Amino acid sequence: APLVLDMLNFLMDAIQTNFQQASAVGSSSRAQQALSELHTVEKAVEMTDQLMSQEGAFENQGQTIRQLISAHVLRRVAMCVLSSRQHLAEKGKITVLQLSALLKKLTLLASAPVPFTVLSLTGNPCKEDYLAVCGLKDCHVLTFSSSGSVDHLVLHPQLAFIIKAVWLPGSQTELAIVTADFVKIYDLCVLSPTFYFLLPSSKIRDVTFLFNEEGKNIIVIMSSAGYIYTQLMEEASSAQQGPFYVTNVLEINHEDLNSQVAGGGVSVYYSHVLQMLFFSYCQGKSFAATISRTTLEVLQLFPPALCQWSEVMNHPGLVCCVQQTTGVPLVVMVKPDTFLIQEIKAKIQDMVAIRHTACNEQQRTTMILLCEDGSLRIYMSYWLQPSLQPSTSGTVLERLVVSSLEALESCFAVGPIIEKERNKNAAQELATLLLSLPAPASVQQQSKSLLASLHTSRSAYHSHKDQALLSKAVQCLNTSSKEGKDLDPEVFQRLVITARSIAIMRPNNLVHFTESKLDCCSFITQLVNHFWKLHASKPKNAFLAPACLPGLTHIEATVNALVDIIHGYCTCELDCINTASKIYMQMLLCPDPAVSFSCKQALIRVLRPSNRLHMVRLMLLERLLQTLPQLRNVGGVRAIPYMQVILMLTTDLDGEDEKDKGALDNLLSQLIAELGMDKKDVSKKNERSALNEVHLVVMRLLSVFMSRTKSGSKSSICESSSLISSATAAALLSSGAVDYCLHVLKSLLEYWKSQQSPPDMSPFFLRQYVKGHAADVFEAYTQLLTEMVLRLPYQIKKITDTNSRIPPPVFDHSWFYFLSEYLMIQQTPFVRRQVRKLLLFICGSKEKYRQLRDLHTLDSHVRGIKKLLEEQGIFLRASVVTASSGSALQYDTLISLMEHLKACAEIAAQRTINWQKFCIKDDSVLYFLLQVSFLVDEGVSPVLLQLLSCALCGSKVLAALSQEDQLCTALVNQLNKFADKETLIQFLRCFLLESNSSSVRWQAHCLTLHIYRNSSKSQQELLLDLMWSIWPELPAYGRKAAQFVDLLGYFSLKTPQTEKKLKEYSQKAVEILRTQNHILTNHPNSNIYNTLSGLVEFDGYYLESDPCLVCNNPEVPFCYIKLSSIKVDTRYTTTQQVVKLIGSHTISKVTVKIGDLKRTKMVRTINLYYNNRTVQAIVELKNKPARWHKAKKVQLTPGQTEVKIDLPLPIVASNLMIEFADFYFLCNACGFCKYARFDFMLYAKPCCAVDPIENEEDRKKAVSNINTLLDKADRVYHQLMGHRPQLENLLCKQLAQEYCGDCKNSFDELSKIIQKVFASRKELLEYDLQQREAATKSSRTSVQPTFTASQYRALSVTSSTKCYGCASAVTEHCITLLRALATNPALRHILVSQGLIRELFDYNLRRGAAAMREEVRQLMCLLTR
């Protein structure tokens, strides 16, 4: 006891030295001292060596390269070591390998074919990822992938020799390449470098850059003349204002130091690891200097040529130069007071080295130096020792001290009370002094046990321990503070650890002591200030850091522990809180995420899990909310933590207390004012604004509030809602959020039209989207704002409807109009789904939903069609469609009209009541529609008729193939109101008789039927009069007019009227019948066909003089013919195939059948081009711009096997050109495509046309063509008229072969010629009238006559009278009509009084076919009933 203490009192004298010096305690002072001694104390060069597979393992304008390298100007270092991985590494291909086997007769990834002349390869120092492969005037930047396999972007040097390039220190994104006169620095982040410098004189020998006292860039070059020059690269010297002349030259006055510095310099290198720089000349002298951090004044200086020292990372003080002349690499290791230089057939070309881990997990440096024979050499701590590097078998001293602790423990536990108590005071003092300084952990344990025993109350042990230790730490820190000396890293760590431990143990006593006054708790604020300064002191780039690890080490852990301490001290004493808030806030807004994120996680863990804690929560909510205005410039990405914290405290928000409800009120009010729902200059929201980003974050916060659902118990009461949710609803409704949202959406309409480790940033911006767009989770401003401005009002409505008390919100019809406008503008799935839910909830009933969207669709489509036609001049006056130029529109206008109209047709197709309703809304749909169909091309007629027929006839009848009946009846009366009689006649004529199609005629019949069957009574009379009037000319439109006959008959037998009218009609019909009969009877061609019909199978009356065009154009059906079986010529190029088909065909569809597709190479998109322009040369029309008319842009999925491209209106084509538009392959000569094979077909029938007309060249060409065709037809005419003689001969007494052989084929030839001739005449007239109107347009007093639509149809581009077929067909139709109209008994009497029985029995008795004759007999029997 007394003797133990007696020896120990002396022992502590050096025991304190051992304990403080032990461990990392004492490392900081030793390191700083050694650094000072290195930079300050003199050293001497010492020659020594103790510091430190076969050849042929290696492979392989070089003359001028030899020249420059001989000039010693440049050299070769072909090596690199990419590791932070295990990557390490003439023919323009160098192999980059791994050396793992050597790492843990050699056993030694990928290779890269270098496309540039290579003298070296340099990895970026901050990041071994990118490597620059370096030559003189060509170099590359390669991002080798994870396995080392080759992307490469080849750097454009624009050489007018580039010495070398360096990626800026710690700047993995920056790099500069310097040549012999100028240096250009570019950032890979942003061709155009961001810096450029040049020299007023001499060459650029060596160029380096470093940091300032703050750390800013400075560029210093040892020139060719040796003049060392310095500059500060900023906005002035940057390449933005141009390459800058170098200005200042640093001074060195040594004994050795005339425009040529001792015969030139050698190099330049300013190590940041040593915090120094070296200097050397082509004289061959070496020296070392350290200079001021801002004055750059060389503070401390010390004294074959030299080149290219290299420091191994994680290997302090080790440098590897190479003698310029001797070629000899030399190693320099510098402790403070000496500079050991060591030198290590196989003429070493280069070397490499890395401080790696050997088989013993020991960081030993391995150096593989490469020779001239391909051989290798293996080569291999002053600052690297643990006592210099920041962090009982040991000390027999610690062993004896442990023995002493055992002795003291025994001398207490078995020692008497008297001795124990008498020695108590001194022993406790000694033990306190012992535990005071840092020492062994086992010493701490033994002392703690002994001292807790010594304290009779272990609570007293803890109390006295807290008081003493805290006082000691506080005094130490306060000395360091008033002193202003920088806090040692481990010092702050140890203090924070100790205080955190004591606070976690006994926070109340901690508050009492750290609060007792030996403002409030200045230790806390001073400690935080210390933390801020020290973190500001962090080594910026850890690579470029000085030999020590400056700044915090386990930074986030220190932050979390400090937060624990601060929160505890705040909790224990309430009156400090107003401070702590701001303190924490300055941290919860710090720049680097390492502070803010760690603090947010810390606090969330901190306040998490009586009334005391809730009160602390409320007070914090008030305090931070006041500082909420400070985030005005925070930046959204640098602001999510605050809101995460607000919600985090809001986790247990029970507003039930009047105070608690008041708290909710303050929160909601502050947030709402922060958003500012009443700005009214909302157009500023369009751009991405910092306050805008913060605002959006706040909105997402309020949304996580409203969407918060405090799901209750099993009870079905509708009032178990989150009080936070109810409040958010109430406040947003009070703030008029609807109008703000709507003004935002309208304001965004402009942009919408114009557009055509990861931090756990949950829950504001989700983790997945973080993974997907880690660039900036506040970057997608427009889309996120749109999503929010939608998804808020829906939830607002959810609460609003759900609340019994609150009357519902009211948004005006602008809501429907604007949201529907949003829907039609395209958007991705999220926007679409949200908008749909919004409209559906808003408009209540799904019927109303679909109806409203439909009406919008129709309104847009009609507006679009009207504007399209107006772009061609067509103008509706009030209800009078008028046109000025009557030309036919090109394909562009037609595809335009067809797209919109067909869309409308599909819409009306889904259901009819919608089309009926939309039409009932606007009275400007019908007459415009019919007027448009009257002028539009024929191929567009079927669609327009389908729509109009759906409108008036309706769904019941059309599908068959009261409310809707009323709609149809009213709309029929409407059409009656708007229609003009002349237009009605023009419609009947154009679409019932003249049309060539069958479906067109059928639909015409349906529309006429339904319109007539329901028009007004007197309207019915008007229609009957008009139709029976037009029937007088039925001879001309002739054989195609069956529909009109049927319609006239139905109208006749259904409608009763005055006998004068009926008599008039009967007179008309009888006269027509008689005249047609007579025209039949005197026919010169009557005899021959008359005889021949009863002899051979008479198919067609092939004995007409001027071919009846109506009889001469049957309806050839579209045949599904393969694109193979029509070809005439084919060819291919790199990516296209040109085929010249047999002849002009009207293609409506085409199908690509794909065989044996290649997974490596697929074609996604294809562009098809048609051309119907005259060409006999395959090469001539391969010009894509001239001879390609695009058809349909078709892109499919990869692997798609059957494609069906159908032109909306069929295209008339001759030469087709198919190109594989987009990919996901055609050979030059034969076009073999090893990807696959393709086949094609088309549902087409031939089309008889010519070349389109373009120029007077076409005028002469076509005139000649038509003339020649006329010659051919003339030969046909003479020869064919010749058959009449021999035909008469065979008639006099074979004939099958005679005419059925000849006459048929003859008529075939003449028909081909005639059809071609007519089409050609049409084309010539088209060009004539088009040039006429165009040249007439220039005349200004000549206002081009706006021709009516009827004038237009007659203006724009009939069976021949003496056609025995025409007369016969007229007879058949007339017989049908007569056998019909006789049915009225009064009509029986009237027709009998006509006495036509004579005419029929006499003229048409045996005429007509079998069926014709039989019907005739039936009629004759009937007429005398």
Author numbering: 1808 to 1859, 1865 to 1872, 1881 to 1904, 1909 to 1913, 1917 to 1931, 1939 to 1942, 1945 to 1986, 1988 to 1997, ...
From the paper:
Focused cryo-EM classification and refinement yielded density maps that resolved all folded regions of the human UBR4 complex (HsUBR42/KCMF12/CALM12), except the flexible C-terminal extension bearing the catalytic hemi-RING E3 module. The structural motifs that constitute the ring-like scaffold of the E4 complex were well defined by EM density, but the functional domains lining the inner cavity or extending outward into the periphery displayed high flexibility, as reflected by their lower local resolution. The largest intrusion into the E4 cavity is a multidomain appendage formed by the beta-propeller (BP), the UBR box and the beta-sandwich 1 (BS1) of UBR4 together with the N-terminal zinc binding domains of KCMF1. While analyzing our cryo-EM data, we noted additional low-resolution density inside the central cavity of the UBR4 complex. As we could assign all ordered domains of the UBR4 complex, we suspected that this extra density represents a copurified substrate bound in the inner cavity, visualizing the mechanism of substrate recognition. The density was connected to the E4 by the ZZ-DZB motifs of KCMF1, hinting that these domains act as substrate receptors. To test this idea, we reconstructed an UBR4 complex lacking ZZ-DZB and determined its cryo-EM structure using the same workflow as for the wild-type complex. In the resulting map, the ZZ-DZB domains were absent as was the connected extra density. Although the ZZ-DZB motif of KCMF1 is central for recognition, efficient capture likely depends on multivalent, low affinity interactions, supplied by accessory UBR4 domains such as the BP, UBR and BS2 that also line the inner cavity.
